[PDB]
From Swiss-Prot, chain A:
Disease in which the protein is involved: Lymphatic malformation 11: A form of primary lymphedema, a disease characterized by swelling of body parts due to developmental anomalies and functional defects of the lymphatic system. Patients with lymphedema may suffer from recurrent local infections. LMPHM11 is an autosomal dominant form characterized by onset of lower extremity edema in the second or third decade of life. Some affected individuals may have subclinical lymphatic malformations.
Subcellular location field: Cell membrane
UniProt name for this protein: Tyrosine-protein kinase receptor Tie-1
Residues bearing carbohydrate: 64
General function of this protein: Transmembrane tyrosine-protein kinase that may modulate TEK/TIE2 activity and contribute to the regulation of angiogenesis.
Maturation and modification: Phosphorylated on tyrosine residues in response to ANGPT1, most likely by TEK/TIE2.
Annotated ranges, domain Fibronectin type-III: 4-93
Provenance organism: Homo sapiens
Tissue specificity annotation: Specifically expressed in developing vascular endothelial cells.
Residues of the full protein shown: 643 to 738 of 1138
Curated annotation (Swiss-Prot), chain B:
The name this protein goes by in its record: Tyrosine-protein kinase receptor Tie-1
Oligomeric and partner information: Heterodimer with TEK/TIE2. Interacts with SVEP1 (via C-terminus).
Domain called Fibronectin type-III: residue spans: 3-88
Disease per UniProt entry: Lymphatic malformation 11: A form of primary lymphedema, a disease characterized by swelling of body parts due to developmental anomalies and functional defects of the lymphatic system. Patients with lymphedema may suffer from recurrent local infections. LMPHM11 is an autosomal dominant form characterized by onset of lower extremity edema in the second or third decade of life. Some affected individuals may have subclinical lymphatic malformations.
Tissue: Specifically expressed in developing vascular endothelial cells.
Lineage: Eukaryota, Metazoa, Chordata, Craniata, Vertebrata
Glycosylation sites: 60
Post-translational note: Phosphorylated on tyrosine residues in response to ANGPT1, most likely by TEK/TIE2.
Encoding gene, per UniProt annotation: TIE1
Cell compartment(s), UniProt: Cell membrane
Amino acid sequence: GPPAPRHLHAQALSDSEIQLTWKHPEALPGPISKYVVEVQVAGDPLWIDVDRPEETSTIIRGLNASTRYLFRMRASIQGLGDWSNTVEESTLG
Amino acid sequence: PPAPRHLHAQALSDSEIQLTWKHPEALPGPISKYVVEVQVPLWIDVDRPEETSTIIRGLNASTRYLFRMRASIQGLGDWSNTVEESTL
């Protein structure tokens, strides 16, 4: 059960890109795996996965000029499943 | 997430190795992806979870390879405050 990242703010570096700045929530139940950012116009919406969870900002590339956007974020905790049976298979010539 | 049962392996010739597995029964909710480990370690997960087989690339010939898999579930937390920003 991951809480949302607090204190969100975006600012456009160029007409075709906007960087997004966020902060860590204080007490979190367990570690998080990644962040998920989404872009919408929004009169379908695109999802962009931020790989490194230890990150406080990222730059959204590939946007349209002179267009307004709305952004949202969420923390993600992936639960690893049990390992399956081990199998062996060698590669030959 | 329960482990994917009945795992199987079968290589091509001298490059790629293909794996095959049966889905696990009785699982609480969906799963996000299947993670696969390859020791000559390196984890290489399959993006699409509704899958029964995948191709393992990058393998030197004449080498004893072994595989193991596991399921995963991305616990997507709550969304953050919505924010607006203009471009020009």
